[PDB]
Amino acid sequence: YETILVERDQRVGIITLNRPQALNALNSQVMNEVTSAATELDDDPDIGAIIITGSAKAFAAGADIKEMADLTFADAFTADFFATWGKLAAVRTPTIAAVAGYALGGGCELAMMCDVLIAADTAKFGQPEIKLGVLPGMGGSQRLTRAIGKAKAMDLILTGRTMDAAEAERSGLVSRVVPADDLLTEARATATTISQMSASAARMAKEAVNRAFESSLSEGLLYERRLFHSAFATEDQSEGMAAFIEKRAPQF
Amino acid sequence: TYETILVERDQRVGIITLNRPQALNALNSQVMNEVTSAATELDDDPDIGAIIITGSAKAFAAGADIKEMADLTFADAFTADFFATWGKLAAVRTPTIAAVAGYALGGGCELAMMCDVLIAADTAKFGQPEIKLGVLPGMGGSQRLTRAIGKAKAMDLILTGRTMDAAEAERSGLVSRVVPADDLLTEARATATTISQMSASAARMAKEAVNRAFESSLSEGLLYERRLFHSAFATEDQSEGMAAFIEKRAPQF
Amino acid sequence: TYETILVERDQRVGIITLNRPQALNALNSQVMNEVTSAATELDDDPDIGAIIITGSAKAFAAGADIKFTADFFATWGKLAAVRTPTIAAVAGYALGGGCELAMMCDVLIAADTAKFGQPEIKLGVLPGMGGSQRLTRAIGKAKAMDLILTGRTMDAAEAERSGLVSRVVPADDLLTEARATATTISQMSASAARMAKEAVNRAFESSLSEGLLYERRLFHSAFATEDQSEGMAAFIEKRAPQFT
Fold it and tell me: Measured between CB atoms, does C161 come within 8 Å of chain A?
């Protein structure tokens, strides 16, 4: 890959954005490579969790503007610009965004696509898209609002102001804030814990949670209960519960 | 009379206390059935306008009885519709207050989230350890938790099994208020008293309107609320409430 | 001529000030009609890119006014159909209808004296201006239930950490800060801001999958506008955008 770095430690895949000269600005190539890698990581039975991170300076500053600069409606509708990012949301195993420094525009949206979001105390989030005469194109208006409320999302998206790690955390945007130097350590310790869970259980858990955004509460409750019933058809449930009863450790 | 809980009327407030100290009020089929019976009775009782549910100062409810689940098959689960009876609590029309102290994990965390109002003690620890056991939340955890505290944190909690303290739950949307542990039970009564002294029908309608926010688009929720608001004038309690306020005194609905 | 409000125009910013401190800016039928009429004109005025709604330093609006067929309160829905961005600058009391009116706005800037609540229930009534919906979606069920069922108030700091408000500022600065936020917003591309606002509103009206699709189509549409072209050119060429 030209624009990213991928490594595997045990059951944790790690995708690192790698365009240091452009503060990891997202672009068509990053979109394709990150999705390709995660997809591949998703299909690997030896991987139980996936981390997406950038540099200590930048998770990702935003999309690459030169690419977008000369697109007509026609070009956009035709390529279905940005659509391919959807592939990341379709990944079945848990994804963890480890965010340091700038996560702006596409960058912030990328991080919101992940399931779990760990932020360095230096993290900075934003949706400055409106400054360019456009608006978020990667789910920002949708996922931000749902995380932090209309008042704050409207503020960020209409002004372009940034939000610091502490505000993000108390607002609903991130799971946890840690010291910038521990980011990758915590993120990996977190991915480790998750990849160590039953693979089927974690994939069901994650799917269940995602349901909370796609229907009414009554339907989400029903979905979850049926998925819950299903878990009892898996070997992992039987072992997981026997181990607890036998005050021992679960071996999946 | 019940085996695993204690029910107690205090004027207009019903108080359901999980009584299974040896197991940390761990939920099980019999608690499911007794709590939902008790709450249903209270709900139908005209003399009761608010319902509290609580455990011990050490544990609201620390998970469920795993033995009842260990040997389940999919066919057992589907046929029994395991856990469906809990939906009975959510069907209760009278307002319900979960007074949570200490451990509220797995089904306990989910039982607290089923209530309308959540008062937590200093000591409260919330969590969804289900993943650890090779299953997932089955009493609405994935649904109610995510809607209160947002995707990032729900995913964190549900995938890792990490606990969340009182202070974090308040800052993220899980609980209404945090009070000192020695005061929780006392604070919960006061809140319940306040509610039970509102118009019963107005209170039931208020709670119904808020629940709509999770079942449809905003535009539909708004239309529903508005038609419900209209119907509130078709009551006399509105007259009393107006007169009491004008006369700068307490209403007697 | 407005009898219950003051309407000002500073560059591209429209400012509606509720003006009946005799009742602490309580909202009667007349306030409803005048604010909505004002917001609607400002919306249709091309020289306005942002609209602020504020009360007095003591009360944004202390409440509604006590005293099927008529579809009562339905004219408020007309504030929600305003296309231009709207900012509520809330000082002191925003209770009942006041709190609801502030929630109808896109951006909510509160003074540290701000007090929010829905005391309806104590008069044996219910929120009728969207408070059971917008509040619950802002701050979650446990707090929406608490406020709506007990009538208790919520101070600025709780509103801020809960998701009710965008930001909190000192009471002396509230008006300046809100004007500055409005100025920034009104200096954006008008079409972009209108699209941005409409995109964010979609998040309460359908599933995530449909919201994402809607946003992406709006985004694509933005490339048919001069402003995306100018906004993007001005970035690459490291200068100030001149929006038309």
Answer: yes
